[PDB]
Amino acid sequence: SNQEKIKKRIQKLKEEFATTWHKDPEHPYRTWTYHGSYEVKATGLVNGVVKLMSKPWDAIANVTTMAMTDTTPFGQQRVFKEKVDTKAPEPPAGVREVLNETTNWLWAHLSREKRPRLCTKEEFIKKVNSNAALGAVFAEQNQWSTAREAVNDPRFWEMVDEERENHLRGECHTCIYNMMGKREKKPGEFGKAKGSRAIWFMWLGARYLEFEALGFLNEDHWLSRENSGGGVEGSGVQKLGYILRDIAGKQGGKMYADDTAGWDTRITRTDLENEAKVLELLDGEHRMLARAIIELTYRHKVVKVMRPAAEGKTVMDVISREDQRGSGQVVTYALNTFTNIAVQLVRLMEAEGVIGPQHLEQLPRKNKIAVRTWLFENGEERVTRMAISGDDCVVKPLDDRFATALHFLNAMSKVRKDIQEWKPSHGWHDWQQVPFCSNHFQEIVMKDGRSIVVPCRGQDELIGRARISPGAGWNVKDTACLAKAYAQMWLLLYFHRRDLRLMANAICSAVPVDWVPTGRTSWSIHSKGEWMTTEDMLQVWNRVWIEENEWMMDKTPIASWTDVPYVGKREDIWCGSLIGTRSRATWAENIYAAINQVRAVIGKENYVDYMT
């Protein structure tokens, strides 16, 4: 019967590629049913402006060696084997009973005020025509070039409608996963560095349907701090410091921020079941559509991934399994956030003595009671002791027993990264040490007495990323506008870093004052892009850090950059600054040559001297 639910998708595939379809180089797959293969053409970039404005960093390996993705069949195969051909064991009965109660409570709290609703075509279109259906990677719309043209084409919507009737009928024909490649390991301190991950694509239509049925969780902000207490969905990275500093303001133990080692490979069928409880919030047609997404696309999956063969030849494998995620779903972040809140609530209950190692296998009735009673009595408060964004977590428990509350965690397969399995976690007394969404956060004193909580992250990573140009069809102009997007990002979020302040200015001096930044500087749901503008960045800085800063009680505007603070030198150096260095001194002193060489490549335009 699993065979039954993937039939139509396999069949559509054997048909379309009946030509080259064969069954089996001796395939690698261990935990995925293998159906067959066919021949395909395989699949498989420096920002001159940024490069030119950052000569010292030519000498830094973290920067020069940086690559984002590996789209080759080789990389597809490696990431699949290391992160997808894997199976997390299901938690024991006692643990299942605890997650059951815990997720019942969380669903009821998240739906206390908000009502589910279908998302719409015109809504999807609105989303597509802008700054993307980000992360939920689109790119299969190949009867059209782009998503913009596809959603404008009446025939596209007929495709959607047709599959929509199949779902309303209980079948999926087109909703198929394609593993495009691997996002490379990202940098970070032991226990926070992100491992490699899979990049999933689906037909644009399968994304619409998913978005129609379940997108409400994102569009109506179910995981906003206001709705969920623990979540931070909707906030920009510039808000997260402040939220952490508020959590730190509460009475309790040290602050914890344990990562799970490969969170997406560690979601269980139990977790999916508890997530699938959304269905019970929906009615009529809405629930029918959602039930199909959950059952036919989330649960009975079909996957295409490339593999190297024979004579510099590559095949596409077709495989299936009843599974869960890795992302590639419209609601991956929202459901990761949900499950992670649940996970942390269970950890807190162990830390607080409500449940023990004795309860893993079987949950005594008395304990079932104490669980429901604790959630009811405490859930609303404990949730505010958390900052949860996807698999990222920060939690401040009542006391440091939390450090040893590990039995339920490990039994849930939510094994922590880079620490021995039963070694107590490390917590920090100082909230400014705590890592969260690739940053930490520092409180700094501005010249005028007032203070701000700003985000800091390894500077090499930032320069490295700005140096990368995604283009092939990125212009001189597009290249300069991308460089400008990065520079202005740094001015809004990392102005407190000397080298970046200096490098943002020089980039901005070097690109026409009237060119609008384009492209994207971050994939993070927390990267809001107030820097995608031609508005003077001081004004934008004032708006973010003073005017709209709800932790800023005095609204007195900052008047010049010379009044906008830097971290202390010690910090700047800790996070990768090159100040106090011969090459960076030389660089600061010759900058103008680089700025001029850029103005002279781009040519005669309106420029502005921001180095004053």
Site residues for ligand GTP per CB under 6 A: 135, 194, 197, 263-264, 327, 336, 390-392, 437-438, 522-524, 527
Partner from Zn ion, ligand GTP, none binding residue 214, C-beta < 5-8 Å depending on class: none
Q: What's the CA angle centered on 325, arms 319 and 329, to 5 degrees?
A: 105
Partner from Zn ion, ligand GTP, none binding residue 458, C-beta < 5-8 Å depending on class: none
CB of 205 to ligand GTP, least distance (A): 21
Partner from Zn ion, ligand GTP, none binding residue 270, C-beta < 5-8 Å depending on class: none
Cβ closest to Zn ion, residue 125 vs residue 159: 159
Partner from Zn ion, ligand GTP, none binding residue 575, C-beta < 5-8 Å depending on class: Zn ion
Pairing of strands 386-389, 392-395: antiparallel
Token code pair at residue 91: 């938690």
CB of 611 to ligand GTP, least distance (A): 27
To which H or E segment does residue 319 belong?
Answer: strand 313-322
CB of 265 to ligand GTP, least distance (A): 9
CB of 199 to ligand GTP, least distance (A): 8
Q: How far apart are CA 10 and CA 213, in angstroms?
A: 24
DSSP 8-state symbol, 46: B
Using rule CB under 5 A, residue 175 touches Zn ion: yes
Known binding residue 119? Answer is no
CB of 406 to Zn ion, least distance (A): 29
Q: How far apart are CA 595 and CA 506, in angstroms?
A: 6
Tell me the C-alpha to C-alpha distance, in Å, between residue 593 and each of 229, 487, 586, 589, 612. Answer: 51, 18, 12, 9, 15
Partner from Zn ion, ligand GTP, none binding residue 349, C-beta < 5-8 Å depending on class: none
Cβ closest to ligand GTP, residue 376 vs residue 523: 523
Using rule CB under 5 A, residue 456 touches Zn ion: yes
Partner from ligand GTP, Zn ion, none binding residue 522, C-beta < 5-8 Å depending on class: ligand GTP
What SS3 string covers 222-244?
A: CCCHHHHCCECCCCCHHHHHHHH
CB of 198 to ligand GTP, least distance (A): 7
Using rule CB under 5 A, residue 244 touches Zn ion: no
CB of 427 to ligand GTP, least distance (A): 20
Q: What's the CA angle centered on 359, arms 356 and 364, to 5 degrees?
A: 120
Partner from ligand GTP, Zn ion, none binding residue 456, C-beta < 5-8 Å depending on class: Zn ion
To which H or E segment does residue 77 belong?
Answer: helix 73-83
DSSP 8-state symbol, 456: E
Known binding residue 481? Answer is no
CB 56 within 8 A of CB 578: yes
Cβ closest to ligand GTP, residue 438 vs residue 509: 438
Of 166-174, 189-197, 247-255, 554-562, which segment contacts Zn ion by CB under 5 A? 166-174
Cβ closest to ligand GTP, residue 342 vs residue 355: 342
C-beta nearest to ligand GTP: residue: 327
Cβ closest to Zn ion, residue 206 vs residue 371: 206
User: How many Cβ atoms from other residues are within 10 Å of residue 300's Cβ?
Assistant: 21
Known binding residue 437? Answer is no
Q: What's the CA angle centered on 190, arms 459 and 440, to 5 degrees?
A: 45
What SS3 string covers 115-135?
A: CCCCCCHHHHHHHHCCCCCCC
CB of 262 to ligand GTP, least distance (A): 8
Please, after which residues is the chain broken with C–N above 2.5 Å? 44
CB of 465 to Zn ion, least distance (A): 16
Cβ closest to ligand GTP, residue 135 vs residue 565: 135
**What is the Cα gyration radius of the chain?**
25
CB 537 within 8 A of CB 488: yes
Cβ closest to Zn ion, residue 175 vs residue 331: 175
Partner from ligand GTP, Zn ion, none binding residue 542, C-beta < 5-8 Å depending on class: none
x/- track of binding to Zn ion for residues 403-442 (CB under 5 A): ----------------------------------------
CB 73 within 8 A of CB 180: no
Cβ closest to Zn ion, residue 189 vs residue 547: 189
What three-state secondary structure class fits 384?
coil
Contacts of residues 166-170 at CB distance under 8 Å and 24 or more positions apart, as own/partner, are: 166/8, 167/209, 167/288, 167/289, 167/292, 167/293, 167/296, 168/285, 168/288, 168/289, 168/292, 170/292
Using rule CB under 5 A, residue 172 touches Zn ion: yes
Known binding residue 172? Answer is yes
CB 453 within 8 A of CB 246: no
CB of 196 to ligand GTP, least distance (A): 10
Partner from ligand GTP, Zn ion, none binding residue 88, C-beta < 5-8 Å depending on class: none
Cβ closest to Zn ion, residue 54 vs residue 459: 459
Cβ closest to ligand GTP, residue 253 vs residue 326: 326
Known binding residue 440? Answer is yes
CB of 146 to ligand GTP, least distance (A): 21
CB of 260 to ligand GTP, least distance (A): 9
Of 57-65, 454-462, 495-503, 527-535, which segment contacts Zn ion by CB under 5 A? 454-462
DSSP string, 163-195: HHHHHHTT--SS--EEEEEEEPPPP-STTT---
Q: How far apart are CA 520 and CA 587, in angstroms?
A: 27
Which burial class, exposed, middle or buried, applies to 277 when counting CB atoms under 10 A from its CB (0-12, 13-18, 19+)? Answer: middle
Tell me the C-alpha to C-alpha distance, in Å, between residue 544 and each of 27, 131, 220, 446, 560. Answer: 53, 20, 23, 15, 15
Cβ closest to ligand GTP, residue 229 vs residue 328: 328
Q: Which amino acid is at 219?
A: E
Partner from ligand GTP, Zn ion, none binding residue 172, C-beta < 5-8 Å depending on class: Zn ion
Q: Within 572-591, which residues bind Zn ion (CB under 5 A)?
A: 575
Partner from ligand GTP, Zn ion, none binding residue 175, C-beta < 5-8 Å depending on class: Zn ion
Cβ closest to ligand GTP, residue 56 vs residue 195: 195
Known binding residue 167? Answer is yes
For helices 284-292 and 204-214, angle between their N-to-C axes, nearest 10 degrees: 140
Binding-site positions: 163, 167, 172, 175, 440, 456, 575
Binding stretches for Zn ion (CB under 5 A): 172, 175, 456, 575
Binding-site positions for Zn(2+): 163, 167, 172, 175, 440, 456, 575
